[PDB]
Short mmCIF file of C-alpha atoms and ligand atoms in Angstrom, two decimals:
data_model
loop_
_atom_site.label_atom_id
_atom_site.label_comp_id
_atom_site.label_asym_id
_atom_site.label_seq_id
_atom_site.Cartn_x
_atom_site.Cartn_y
_atom_site.Cartn_z
CA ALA Z 1 0.00 0.00 0.00
CA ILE Z 2 2.64 2.56 1.06
CA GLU Z 3 4.97 1.89 -1.89
CA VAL Z 4 1.94 2.21 -4.17
CA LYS Z 5 0.71 5.45 -2.57
CA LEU Z 6 4.18 6.96 -2.87
CA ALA Z 7 4.47 5.97 -6.54
CA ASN Z 8 1.05 7.50 -7.28
CA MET Z 9 2.00 10.70 -5.48
CA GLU Z 10 5.26 10.87 -7.45
CA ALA Z 11 3.12 10.71 -10.60
CA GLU Z 12 0.86 13.51 -9.34
CA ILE Z 13 3.97 15.60 -8.68
CA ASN Z 14 5.28 15.07 -12.22
CA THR Z 15 1.93 16.13 -13.67
CA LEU Z 16 1.78 19.21 -11.45
CA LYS Z 17 5.32 20.23 -12.44
CA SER Z 18 4.41 20.02 -16.13
CA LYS Z 19 1.19 21.95 -15.58
CA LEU Z 20 3.08 24.79 -13.83
CA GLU Z 21 5.66 24.93 -16.65
CA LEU Z 22 2.64 25.20 -19.00
CA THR Z 23 1.24 28.06 -16.92
CA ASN Z 24 4.62 29.79 -17.20
CA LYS Z 25 4.67 29.25 -20.97
CA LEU Z 26 1.15 30.58 -21.50
CA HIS Z 27 1.86 33.64 -19.39
CA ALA Z 28 5.05 34.53 -21.31
CA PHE Z 29 3.17 34.11 -24.60
CA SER Z 30 0.31 36.35 -23.39
CA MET Z 31 2.84 39.00 -22.50
CA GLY Z 32 4.44 38.88 -25.94
CA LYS Z 33 7.34 36.42 -25.74
CA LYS Z 34 8.29 35.46 -29.30
CA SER Z 35 9.38 31.94 -30.26
CA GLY Z 36 13.09 31.44 -29.63
CA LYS Z 37 13.40 34.93 -28.15
CA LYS Z 38 14.07 36.18 -24.62
CA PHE Z 39 11.03 37.40 -22.70
CA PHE Z 40 11.15 41.10 -21.75
CA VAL Z 41 8.67 42.50 -19.22
CA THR Z 42 8.05 45.55 -17.02
CA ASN Z 43 5.70 46.79 -14.29
CA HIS Z 44 6.30 50.36 -15.55
CA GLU Z 45 7.84 51.33 -12.19
CA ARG Z 46 10.75 53.78 -12.12
CA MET Z 47 13.45 53.17 -9.52
CA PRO Z 48 17.28 53.26 -9.03
CA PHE Z 49 19.45 50.64 -10.78
CA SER Z 50 20.20 48.87 -7.49
CA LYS Z 51 16.47 48.22 -7.05
CA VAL Z 52 15.90 47.16 -10.66
CA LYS Z 53 18.69 44.59 -10.21
CA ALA Z 54 17.31 43.34 -6.90
CA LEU Z 55 13.82 43.17 -8.34
CA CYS Z 56 14.62 41.21 -11.51
CA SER Z 57 16.85 38.90 -9.44
CA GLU Z 58 13.96 38.27 -7.07
CA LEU Z 59 11.86 37.06 -10.02
CA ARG Z 60 14.76 34.90 -11.17
CA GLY Z 61 15.49 37.07 -14.18
CA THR Z 62 17.99 39.82 -14.94
CA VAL Z 63 17.96 43.46 -16.04
CA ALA Z 64 17.14 43.60 -19.76
CA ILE Z 65 20.16 43.47 -22.05
CA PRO Z 66 19.94 44.11 -25.83
CA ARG Z 67 22.41 41.78 -27.59
CA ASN Z 68 21.46 43.10 -31.04
CA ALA Z 69 19.24 45.70 -32.71
CA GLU Z 70 16.26 43.34 -32.74
CA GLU Z 71 16.27 42.87 -28.97
CA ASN Z 72 16.91 46.58 -28.61
CA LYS Z 73 13.67 47.34 -30.44
CA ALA Z 74 11.86 44.67 -28.36
CA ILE Z 75 12.96 46.27 -25.09
CA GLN Z 76 12.08 49.70 -26.55
CA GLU Z 77 8.48 48.75 -27.24
CA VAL Z 78 8.14 47.08 -23.83
CA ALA Z 79 9.48 50.02 -21.83
CA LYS Z 80 7.77 52.92 -23.61
CA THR Z 81 9.82 55.29 -21.42
CA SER Z 82 13.46 55.50 -20.30
CA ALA Z 83 14.66 52.20 -18.83
CA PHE Z 84 17.90 50.84 -17.34
CA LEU Z 85 19.82 48.17 -19.26
CA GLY Z 86 21.95 45.52 -17.53
CA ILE Z 87 25.14 47.33 -18.54
CA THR Z 88 27.56 49.49 -16.50
CA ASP Z 89 31.11 50.84 -16.67
CA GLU Z 90 31.77 50.68 -12.92
CA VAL Z 91 35.06 48.77 -13.18
CA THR Z 92 36.98 50.75 -15.79
CA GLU Z 93 35.52 54.03 -17.02
CA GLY Z 94 34.43 53.71 -20.64
CA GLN Z 95 34.56 49.91 -20.51
CA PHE Z 96 30.92 48.88 -20.46
CA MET Z 97 30.19 45.37 -19.24
CA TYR Z 98 27.04 43.30 -18.88
CA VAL Z 99 25.85 42.77 -15.32
CA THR Z 100 25.90 39.05 -16.17
CA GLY Z 101 29.47 39.18 -17.45
CA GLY Z 102 31.42 40.15 -20.54
CA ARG Z 103 32.39 43.15 -22.64
CA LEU Z 104 29.78 45.06 -24.63
CA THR Z 105 29.14 43.68 -28.14
CA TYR Z 106 26.14 45.59 -29.52
CA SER Z 107 25.62 49.24 -28.58
CA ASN Z 108 23.29 52.00 -29.67
CA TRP Z 109 24.61 55.22 -28.17
CA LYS Z 110 22.93 58.57 -28.73
CA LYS Z 111 24.83 61.56 -30.13
CA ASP Z 112 27.60 62.78 -27.83
CA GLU Z 113 27.11 59.76 -25.55
CA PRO Z 114 28.44 58.22 -23.36
CA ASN Z 115 29.69 61.44 -21.74
CA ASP Z 116 29.97 60.42 -18.07
CA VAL Z 117 28.72 63.90 -17.09
CA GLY Z 118 28.75 65.63 -13.74
CA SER Z 119 30.01 63.57 -10.84
CA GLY Z 120 29.84 60.62 -13.23
CA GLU Z 121 27.47 58.27 -15.08
CA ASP Z 122 28.10 54.53 -14.92
CA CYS Z 123 24.67 53.12 -15.86
CA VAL Z 124 22.81 52.93 -19.16
CA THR Z 125 19.27 53.75 -20.23
CA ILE Z 126 17.47 53.08 -23.47
CA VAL Z 127 15.58 56.31 -24.27
CA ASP Z 128 13.77 57.95 -27.20
CA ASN Z 129 14.03 56.05 -30.48
CA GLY Z 130 15.86 53.29 -28.65
CA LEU Z 131 19.14 55.19 -28.37
CA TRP Z 132 21.33 54.89 -25.28
CA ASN Z 133 22.46 57.45 -22.75
CA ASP Z 134 24.72 56.80 -19.81
CA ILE Z 135 23.10 58.03 -16.64
CA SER Z 136 23.69 57.99 -12.91
CA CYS Z 137 22.86 54.60 -11.45
CA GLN Z 138 21.14 56.47 -8.61
CA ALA Z 139 18.65 58.06 -10.98
CA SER Z 140 15.23 56.39 -11.27
CA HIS Z 141 14.23 54.72 -14.52
CA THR Z 142 11.74 52.07 -15.67
CA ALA Z 143 12.50 48.53 -14.48
CA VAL Z 144 12.61 46.01 -17.33
CA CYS Z 145 13.53 42.38 -16.74
CA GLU Z 146 14.51 39.66 -19.17
CA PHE Z 147 13.94 35.92 -18.91
CA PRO Z 148 15.57 33.24 -21.16
CA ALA Z 149 14.39 32.33 -24.65
CA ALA U 1 14.29 2.94 0.13
CA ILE U 2 10.90 4.32 1.19
CA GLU U 3 12.38 7.04 3.39
CA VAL U 4 14.68 8.31 0.64
CA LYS U 5 11.74 8.60 -1.74
CA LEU U 6 9.70 10.48 0.86
CA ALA U 7 12.51 12.94 1.47
CA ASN U 8 12.87 13.49 -2.25
CA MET U 9 9.13 14.09 -2.42
CA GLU U 10 9.37 16.72 0.35
CA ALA U 11 12.11 18.39 -1.73
CA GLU U 12 10.01 18.25 -4.91
CA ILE U 13 7.03 19.80 -3.12
CA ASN U 14 9.11 22.60 -1.59
CA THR U 15 10.65 23.31 -4.99
CA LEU U 16 7.17 23.44 -6.49
CA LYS U 17 5.96 25.78 -3.78
CA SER U 18 8.81 28.17 -4.42
CA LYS U 19 8.34 28.12 -8.20
CA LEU U 20 4.59 28.77 -7.89
CA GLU U 21 5.30 31.67 -5.55
CA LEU U 22 7.66 32.91 -8.30
CA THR U 23 5.00 32.51 -10.98
CA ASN U 24 2.58 34.57 -8.85
CA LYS U 25 5.19 37.31 -8.34
CA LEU U 26 6.13 37.49 -12.02
CA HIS U 27 2.47 37.70 -13.01
CA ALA U 28 1.78 40.55 -10.59
CA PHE U 29 4.86 42.36 -11.87
CA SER U 30 3.62 41.89 -15.47
CA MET U 31 0.19 43.22 -14.49
CA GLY U 32 1.81 46.41 -13.22
CA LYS U 33 2.16 45.70 -9.50
CA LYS U 34 4.44 48.39 -8.06
CA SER U 35 6.74 47.54 -5.15
CA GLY U 36 4.87 47.63 -1.84
CA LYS U 37 1.67 48.57 -3.63
CA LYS U 38 -1.48 46.55 -4.15
CA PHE U 39 -2.31 45.90 -7.79
CA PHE U 40 -5.45 45.98 -9.90
CA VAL U 41 -6.67 43.74 -12.72
CA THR U 42 -9.73 43.48 -14.94
CA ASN U 43 -10.97 41.25 -17.79
CA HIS U 44 -13.04 44.23 -19.01
CA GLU U 45 -16.31 42.41 -18.43
CA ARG U 46 -19.34 44.35 -17.21
CA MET U 47 -21.59 42.71 -14.63
CA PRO U 48 -23.79 43.47 -11.57
CA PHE U 49 -21.97 44.20 -8.29
CA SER U 50 -22.83 40.81 -6.72
CA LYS U 51 -21.10 39.03 -9.59
CA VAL U 52 -18.00 41.25 -9.35
CA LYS U 53 -17.75 40.42 -5.62
CA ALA U 54 -18.06 36.71 -6.22
CA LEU U 55 -15.50 36.78 -9.04
CA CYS U 56 -12.87 38.75 -7.12
CA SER U 57 -13.48 36.76 -3.97
CA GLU U 58 -12.97 33.58 -6.01
CA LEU U 59 -9.52 34.89 -7.06
CA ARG U 60 -8.63 35.70 -3.45
CA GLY U 61 -8.91 39.41 -4.07
CA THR U 62 -11.70 41.96 -3.53
CA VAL U 63 -13.58 44.48 -5.68
CA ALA U 64 -11.12 47.40 -6.07
CA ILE U 65 -11.06 50.04 -3.33
CA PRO U 66 -9.33 53.43 -3.84
CA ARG U 67 -7.74 54.38 -0.48
CA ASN U 68 -6.15 57.49 -1.97
CA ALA U 69 -5.74 59.52 -5.17
CA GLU U 70 -2.86 57.39 -6.49
CA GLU U 71 -4.86 54.22 -6.15
CA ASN U 72 -7.88 55.93 -7.63
CA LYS U 73 -5.90 57.00 -10.73
CA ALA U 74 -4.45 53.48 -10.98
CA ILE U 75 -7.92 51.91 -10.88
CA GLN U 76 -9.17 54.45 -13.43
CA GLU U 77 -6.37 53.50 -15.84
CA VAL U 78 -6.97 49.77 -15.49
CA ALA U 79 -10.74 50.13 -15.89
CA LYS U 80 -10.90 52.48 -18.91
CA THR U 81 -14.70 52.67 -18.41
CA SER U 82 -17.15 52.82 -15.50
CA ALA U 83 -16.33 50.19 -12.86
CA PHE U 84 -17.61 49.12 -9.44
CA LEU U 85 -15.61 49.89 -6.28
CA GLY U 86 -15.67 47.85 -3.07
CA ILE U 87 -17.76 50.53 -1.34
CA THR U 88 -21.55 50.49 -0.59
CA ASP U 89 -24.10 51.95 1.85
CA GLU U 90 -26.15 48.72 1.77
CA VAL U 91 -25.90 48.15 5.53
CA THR U 92 -26.92 51.65 6.60
CA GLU U 93 -28.29 54.10 4.03
CA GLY U 94 -26.08 57.15 3.71
CA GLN U 95 -23.08 55.62 5.48
CA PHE U 96 -20.80 54.10 2.88
CA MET U 97 -18.53 51.30 4.05
CA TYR U 98 -15.81 49.19 2.49
CA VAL U 99 -16.96 45.70 1.55
CA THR U 100 -14.14 44.44 3.79
CA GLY U 101 -15.42 46.57 6.66
CA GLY U 102 -15.00 50.09 8.00
CA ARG U 103 -16.42 53.51 7.24
CA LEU U 104 -15.34 55.27 4.06
CA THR U 105 -12.55 57.80 4.52
CA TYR U 106 -10.91 59.01 1.32
CA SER U 107 -13.53 59.70 -1.38
CA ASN U 108 -13.73 61.30 -4.81
CA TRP U 109 -17.41 62.02 -5.34
CA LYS U 110 -18.60 64.00 -8.35
CA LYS U 111 -20.43 67.19 -7.39
CA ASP U 112 -23.93 66.41 -6.02
CA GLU U 113 -23.11 62.73 -5.40
CA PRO U 114 -23.86 60.48 -3.65
CA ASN U 115 -27.57 61.17 -4.23
CA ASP U 116 -29.25 57.75 -3.77
CA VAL U 117 -31.56 58.42 -6.76
CA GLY U 118 -34.81 56.68 -7.65
CA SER U 119 -35.69 53.66 -5.54
CA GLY U 120 -32.09 54.10 -4.33
CA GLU U 121 -28.41 53.59 -5.19
CA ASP U 122 -26.23 51.63 -2.77
CA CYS U 123 -23.18 50.87 -4.91
CA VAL U 124 -20.43 53.04 -6.26
CA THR U 125 -18.74 53.32 -9.64
CA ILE U 126 -15.57 55.20 -10.54
CA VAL U 127 -16.61 56.95 -13.78
CA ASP U 128 -15.51 59.86 -16.00
CA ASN U 129 -12.29 61.58 -14.96
CA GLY U 130 -12.09 59.08 -12.10
CA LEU U 131 -14.79 60.79 -10.04
CA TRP U 132 -17.36 58.66 -8.20
CA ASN U 133 -21.15 58.17 -8.51
CA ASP U 134 -23.46 55.98 -6.44
CA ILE U 135 -25.48 53.66 -8.68
CA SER U 136 -27.79 50.66 -8.39
CA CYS U 137 -25.86 47.50 -7.49
CA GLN U 138 -27.99 45.75 -10.10
CA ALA U 139 -26.55 47.74 -13.00
CA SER U 140 -23.66 46.20 -14.93
CA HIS U 141 -20.26 47.85 -14.71
CA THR U 142 -16.66 46.75 -15.28
CA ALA U 143 -15.25 44.19 -12.87
CA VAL U 144 -11.93 45.34 -11.40
CA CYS U 145 -10.29 43.33 -8.62
CA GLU U 146 -7.54 44.39 -6.25
CA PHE U 147 -4.85 42.20 -4.69
CA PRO U 148 -2.68 42.88 -1.60
CA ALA U 149 0.53 44.90 -1.67
CA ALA Y 1 6.18 8.87 11.01
CA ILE Y 2 6.18 7.34 7.53
CA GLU Y 3 2.40 7.17 7.11
CA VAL Y 4 1.72 10.54 8.75
CA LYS Y 5 4.29 12.26 6.52
CA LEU Y 6 2.81 10.57 3.45
CA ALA Y 7 -0.70 11.74 4.37
CA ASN Y 8 0.64 15.27 4.93
CA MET Y 9 2.33 15.28 1.56
CA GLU Y 10 -0.95 14.24 -0.05
CA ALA Y 11 -2.65 17.30 1.49
CA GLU Y 12 0.35 19.39 0.35
CA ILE Y 13 -0.12 18.15 -3.19
CA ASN Y 14 -3.86 18.81 -3.13
CA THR Y 15 -3.25 22.29 -1.71
CA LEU Y 16 -0.80 22.96 -4.53
CA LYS Y 17 -3.30 21.76 -7.11
CA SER Y 18 -5.94 24.15 -5.77
CA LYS Y 19 -3.43 27.00 -5.72
CA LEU Y 20 -2.32 26.42 -9.31
CA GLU Y 21 -5.95 26.20 -10.44
CA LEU Y 22 -6.36 29.56 -8.69
CA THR Y 23 -3.35 31.01 -10.49
CA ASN Y 24 -4.69 29.80 -13.84
CA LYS Y 25 -8.04 31.50 -13.15
CA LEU Y 26 -6.36 34.77 -12.21
CA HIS Y 27 -4.17 34.62 -15.32
CA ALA Y 28 -7.17 33.89 -17.56
CA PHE Y 29 -9.07 36.80 -16.03
CA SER Y 30 -6.11 39.12 -16.73
CA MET Y 31 -5.86 37.73 -20.28
CA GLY Y 32 -9.40 38.99 -20.84
CA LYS Y 33 -11.36 35.76 -20.35
CA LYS Y 34 -15.08 36.58 -20.06
CA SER Y 35 -17.28 34.40 -17.82
CA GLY Y 36 -18.39 31.17 -19.50
CA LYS Y 37 -16.70 32.25 -22.76
CA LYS Y 38 -13.71 30.78 -24.59
CA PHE Y 39 -10.76 33.12 -24.87
CA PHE Y 40 -8.13 34.03 -27.42
CA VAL Y 41 -4.53 35.01 -26.76
CA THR Y 42 -1.64 36.12 -28.95
CA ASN Y 43 2.02 37.07 -28.54
CA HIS Y 44 1.56 39.19 -31.68
CA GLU Y 45 4.11 37.04 -33.55
CA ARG Y 46 3.57 36.26 -37.24
CA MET Y 47 4.63 32.85 -38.48
CA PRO Y 48 3.68 30.02 -40.88
CA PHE Y 49 0.57 28.00 -40.04
CA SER Y 50 2.55 24.90 -38.99
CA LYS Y 51 4.40 26.92 -36.37
CA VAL Y 52 1.11 28.34 -35.12
CA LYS Y 53 -0.40 24.89 -34.68
CA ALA Y 54 2.75 23.74 -32.92
CA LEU Y 55 2.92 26.77 -30.63
CA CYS Y 56 -0.76 26.52 -29.60
CA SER Y 57 -0.41 22.76 -29.16
CA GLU Y 58 2.45 23.29 -26.68
CA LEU Y 59 0.23 25.61 -24.63
CA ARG Y 60 -2.57 23.01 -24.67
CA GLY Y 61 -4.83 25.21 -26.76
CA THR Y 62 -5.70 25.23 -30.47
CA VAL Y 63 -5.41 27.73 -33.32
CA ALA Y 64 -8.31 30.16 -33.01
CA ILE Y 65 -11.57 29.11 -34.61
CA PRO Y 66 -14.60 31.43 -34.65
CA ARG Y 67 -17.88 29.49 -34.39
CA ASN Y 68 -20.10 32.52 -34.89
CA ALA Y 69 -19.96 36.27 -35.56
CA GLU Y 70 -19.32 37.14 -31.91
CA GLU Y 71 -16.30 34.85 -31.61
CA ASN Y 72 -15.13 36.06 -35.02
CA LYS Y 73 -15.09 39.64 -33.75
CA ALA Y 74 -13.28 38.55 -30.57
CA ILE Y 75 -10.47 36.97 -32.59
CA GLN Y 76 -10.24 40.05 -34.83
CA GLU Y 77 -9.79 42.36 -31.82
CA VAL Y 78 -7.17 40.19 -30.14
CA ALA Y 79 -5.05 39.82 -33.30
CA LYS Y 80 -5.40 43.39 -34.66
CA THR Y 81 -3.71 42.28 -37.90
CA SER Y 82 -4.28 39.29 -40.20
CA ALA Y 83 -4.20 35.99 -38.28
CA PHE Y 84 -4.47 32.29 -39.09
CA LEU Y 85 -7.63 30.43 -38.12
CA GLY Y 86 -7.75 26.72 -37.29
CA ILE Y 87 -9.36 26.05 -40.66
CA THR Y 88 -7.79 24.51 -43.81
CA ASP Y 89 -8.70 22.51 -46.91
CA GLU Y 90 -5.39 20.64 -47.03
CA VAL Y 91 -7.10 17.23 -46.88
CA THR Y 92 -9.42 17.73 -49.84
CA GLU Y 93 -9.10 20.86 -51.99
CA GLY Y 94 -12.21 23.02 -51.88
CA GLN Y 95 -13.42 21.35 -48.68
CA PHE Y 96 -12.54 23.45 -45.63
CA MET Y 97 -12.50 21.68 -42.29
CA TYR Y 98 -11.61 22.59 -38.71
CA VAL Y 99 -8.15 21.48 -37.57
CA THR Y 100 -10.02 19.96 -34.63
CA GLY Y 101 -12.08 17.97 -37.12
CA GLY Y 102 -15.38 18.45 -38.90
CA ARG Y 103 -16.91 20.40 -41.75
CA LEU Y 104 -17.37 24.14 -41.65
CA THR Y 105 -20.40 25.52 -39.89
CA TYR Y 106 -19.98 29.30 -39.55
CA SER Y 107 -18.02 31.16 -42.26
CA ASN Y 108 -17.34 34.82 -43.09
CA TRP Y 109 -15.68 34.68 -46.50
CA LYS Y 110 -14.70 37.91 -48.22
CA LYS Y 111 -16.41 38.12 -51.63
CA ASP Y 112 -15.03 35.58 -54.14
CA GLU Y 113 -13.07 33.71 -51.46
CA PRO Y 114 -11.89 31.02 -50.99
CA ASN Y 115 -10.28 30.93 -54.45
CA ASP Y 116 -7.04 28.88 -54.00
CA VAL Y 117 -5.03 31.42 -56.08
CA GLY Y 118 -1.96 30.67 -58.11
CA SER Y 119 0.10 27.82 -56.74
CA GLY Y 120 -2.55 27.22 -54.08
CA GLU Y 121 -4.07 28.41 -50.81
CA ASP Y 122 -5.08 25.89 -48.15
CA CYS Y 123 -5.10 27.99 -44.97
CA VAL Y 124 -7.40 30.78 -43.80
CA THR Y 125 -6.71 34.18 -42.30
CA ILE Y 126 -9.17 36.52 -40.68
CA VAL Y 127 -8.31 39.92 -42.19
CA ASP Y 128 -8.68 43.55 -41.11
CA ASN Y 129 -12.46 43.60 -41.56
CA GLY Y 130 -13.21 40.37 -39.81
CA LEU Y 131 -13.67 38.76 -43.22
CA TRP Y 132 -11.79 35.63 -44.30
CA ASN Y 133 -9.36 34.86 -47.10
CA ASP Y 134 -7.69 31.59 -47.98
CA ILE Y 135 -3.94 32.08 -48.14
CA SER Y 136 -0.75 30.00 -48.37
CA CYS Y 137 -0.06 28.03 -45.19
CA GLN Y 138 3.58 29.01 -45.73
CA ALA Y 139 2.83 32.73 -45.43
CA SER Y 140 3.43 34.36 -42.05
CA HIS Y 141 0.47 35.61 -40.10
CA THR Y 142 -0.33 36.36 -36.47
CA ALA Y 143 -0.55 33.44 -34.04
CA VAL Y 144 -3.79 33.41 -32.07
CA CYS Y 145 -4.46 30.50 -29.73
CA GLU Y 146 -7.76 29.49 -28.22
CA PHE Y 147 -8.60 28.01 -24.85
CA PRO Y 148 -11.94 26.52 -23.63
CA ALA Y 149 -14.79 28.43 -22.02
O1 LIG G 201 22.46 64.44 -16.74
C1 LIG G 201 21.45 63.62 -17.30
C2 LIG G 201 21.52 63.62 -18.81
O2 LIG G 201 21.19 64.97 -19.24
C3 LIG G 201 21.23 65.20 -20.65
O3 LIG G 201 20.24 64.49 -21.34
C4 LIG G 201 18.88 64.91 -21.11
C5 LIG G 201 18.18 63.92 -20.17
O4 LIG G 201 18.39 62.59 -20.65
C6 LIG G 201 16.69 64.20 -20.08
O5 LIG G 201 16.38 65.23 -19.21
O6 LIG G 201 16.03 64.36 -21.36
C7 LIG G 201 16.67 65.32 -22.25
C8 LIG G 201 15.90 65.30 -23.56
O7 LIG G 201 14.55 65.68 -23.36
C9 LIG G 201 18.15 64.98 -22.46
O8 LIG G 201 18.76 65.96 -23.28
C10 LIG G 201 22.61 64.85 -21.21
O9 LIG G 201 23.57 65.75 -20.69
C11 LIG G 201 22.99 63.41 -20.83
O10 LIG G 201 24.31 63.14 -21.26
C12 LIG G 201 22.91 63.23 -19.32
O11 LIG G 201 23.19 61.87 -18.98
O1 LIG G 202 -25.62 62.36 -12.94
C1 LIG G 202 -26.97 62.40 -12.48
C2 LIG G 202 -27.54 61.00 -12.31
O2 LIG G 202 -27.63 60.42 -13.64
C3 LIG G 202 -28.22 59.12 -13.69
O3 LIG G 202 -29.55 59.11 -13.27
C4 LIG G 202 -30.49 59.95 -13.97
C5 LIG G 202 -30.91 61.07 -13.01
O4 LIG G 202 -31.07 60.52 -11.71
C6 LIG G 202 -32.18 61.77 -13.45
O5 LIG G 202 -31.96 62.73 -14.42
O6 LIG G 202 -33.25 60.88 -13.81
C7 LIG G 202 -32.91 59.90 -14.82
C8 LIG G 202 -34.13 59.02 -15.00
O7 LIG G 202 -35.31 59.80 -15.10
C9 LIG G 202 -31.68 59.08 -14.39
O8 LIG G 202 -31.29 58.24 -15.47
C10 LIG G 202 -27.44 58.13 -12.81
O9 LIG G 202 -26.15 57.91 -13.35
C11 LIG G 202 -27.35 58.70 -11.39
O10 LIG G 202 -26.63 57.83 -10.53
C12 LIG G 202 -26.70 60.07 -11.41
O11 LIG G 202 -26.63 60.58 -10.09
O1 LIG G 203 -7.88 39.46 -53.11
C1 LIG G 203 -7.45 38.59 -54.15
C2 LIG G 203 -6.22 37.79 -53.75
O2 LIG G 203 -5.22 38.74 -53.29
C3 LIG G 203 -3.96 38.15 -52.95
O3 LIG G 203 -3.34 37.52 -54.05
C4 LIG G 203 -3.03 38.27 -55.25
C5 LIG G 203 -4.05 37.90 -56.34
O4 LIG G 203 -4.22 36.49 -56.34
C6 LIG G 203 -3.63 38.37 -57.73
O5 LIG G 203 -3.99 39.67 -58.02
O6 LIG G 203 -2.25 38.08 -58.07
C7 LIG G 203 -1.28 38.49 -57.07
C8 LIG G 203 0.08 38.01 -57.55
O7 LIG G 203 0.41 38.54 -58.82
C9 LIG G 203 -1.62 37.89 -55.70
O8 LIG G 203 -0.67 38.33 -54.74
C10 LIG G 203 -4.15 37.10 -51.84
O9 LIG G 203 -4.60 37.73 -50.65
C11 LIG G 203 -5.17 36.05 -52.31
O10 LIG G 203 -5.41 35.08 -51.31
C12 LIG G 203 -6.49 36.73 -52.68
O11 LIG G 203 -7.40 35.76 -53.17
CA1 CA G 204 33.01 55.79 -13.67
CA1 CA G 205 30.90 56.09 -16.84
CA1 CA G 206 25.06 60.83 -20.49
CA1 CA G 207 -30.27 51.86 0.69
CA1 CA G 208 -27.76 54.59 -0.96
CA1 CA G 209 -25.89 58.70 -8.00
CA1 CA G 210 -4.69 22.40 -51.97
CA1 CA G 211 -7.09 25.42 -51.13
CA1 CA G 212 -7.59 33.58 -51.47
CL1 CL G 213 26.60 56.30 -11.91
CL1 CL G 214 -28.69 49.49 -5.03
CL1 CL G 215 -1.11 26.30 -48.85
#
């Protein structure tokens, strides 16, 4: 009896795990995730980079990072307003790196940017037309997270 | 070994619990939930107050209640059209109360409202410009639910 | 110990099942699901019919099929642009059938359609009028999946 009950429960667990994964798939789809593409999403809340990072991490994602022009446009249409990207030049000034590791491949800087103005600007925001502007990490911008393809 | 399988099952259940909690958090975030703020959702369906209550209750939420101007604006944006609020004077005519209990504090009544017109109006709808009007609970208005912060 | 823990885990599993059902209801409501009505969802991606069937199949739904004018309008509004319907005449030219099986009840063909132009047209797209046109299954149109009422 006990070995049988346990086996049956193990089967119920497998089914439940698959059903949750399905729920996750349907949700991503409803929010616009394209086949074979990363899922970008926002709650339209503006906050400092430290909070965006903590927030996306809490949902098991990361701050949105455009790896090419196509993902840049995707993040642009999701954000609507100015949003932080998971890129900073905190280690060596001018050397932008992804918060998940590695040197910057694709970039879409605005005219006269990055300019590290004032006391300094080590974070990055995607703004109007999808162009980039380095900004203070302490400034508040829209939180956009990315989840794997 | 029975005991080893039971321990694995405890681990599988805990993992499931944590992933479902994550699914709930990601969904709220995608629906616009701001940090430390309750969030609002609607399917844009219009129905009598009693139905809205049942529906929200069934989702472990409650008909939306504006506790301040920010929340009121947020509800207004989600709704898009006239929607019921979790406020009524059903228990004692003239004394509006929250469906979850307590006398109404913050309010945003249109001029000359509430007016309990006709045979009476004991429900409340957020309408044009986000102002409020008491209306018959039997009329159909947009169902908007609120969930905890 | 053994038996008590097993009984607890059974209640844990049942509790999880109820919670996930709850999450699915909340998600459906946010996706726009109207009471007792089937609902349509899209990620706004355009792709060939085969990829639409595959994508909807993964999510345990089916390619959208309008059964009457009301459902046909619902699909139109969700898609916004041309979208494939779960209808084709791939089996027998001239004879449209549902992908779920069966001959065509409701139809909303644009004048002179279906015409199987040029090399051939075995799929159907609901256009920007709500009307239908048979088109190549290899063409890319918006993916709209359907879930039960
Ligand atoms: O110091 C912040 C930022 O200021 C300047 O850019 C302006 C801002 O991004 C914002 O206020 O919008 C303006 C356009 O409406 C934009 O010019 C630049 O000096 C920039 O380099 C700097 O990071
Ligand atoms: O905004 C005024 C009032 O409008 C609607 O009710 C109407 C009025 O009470 C009045 O003019 O009589 C009409 C029927 O003869 C009635 O429709 C409602 O929206 C009401 O709640 C509102 O206060
Ligand atoms: O609305 C008619 C027809 O339009 C589109 O196809 C075009 C026509 O078949 C025709 O004029 O020739 C064109 C190629 O030279 C062709 O694109 C399609 O929407 C078709 O399905 C429709 O029947
Ligand atoms: Ca620096
Ligand atoms: Ca810098
Ligand atoms: Ca700058
Ligand atoms: Ca009364
Ligand atoms: Ca009254
Ligand atoms: Ca009134
Ligand atoms: Ca054919
Ligand atoms: Ca054909
Ligand atoms: Ca045609
Ligand atoms: Cl900075
Ligand atoms: Cl009433
Ligand atoms: Cl074809």
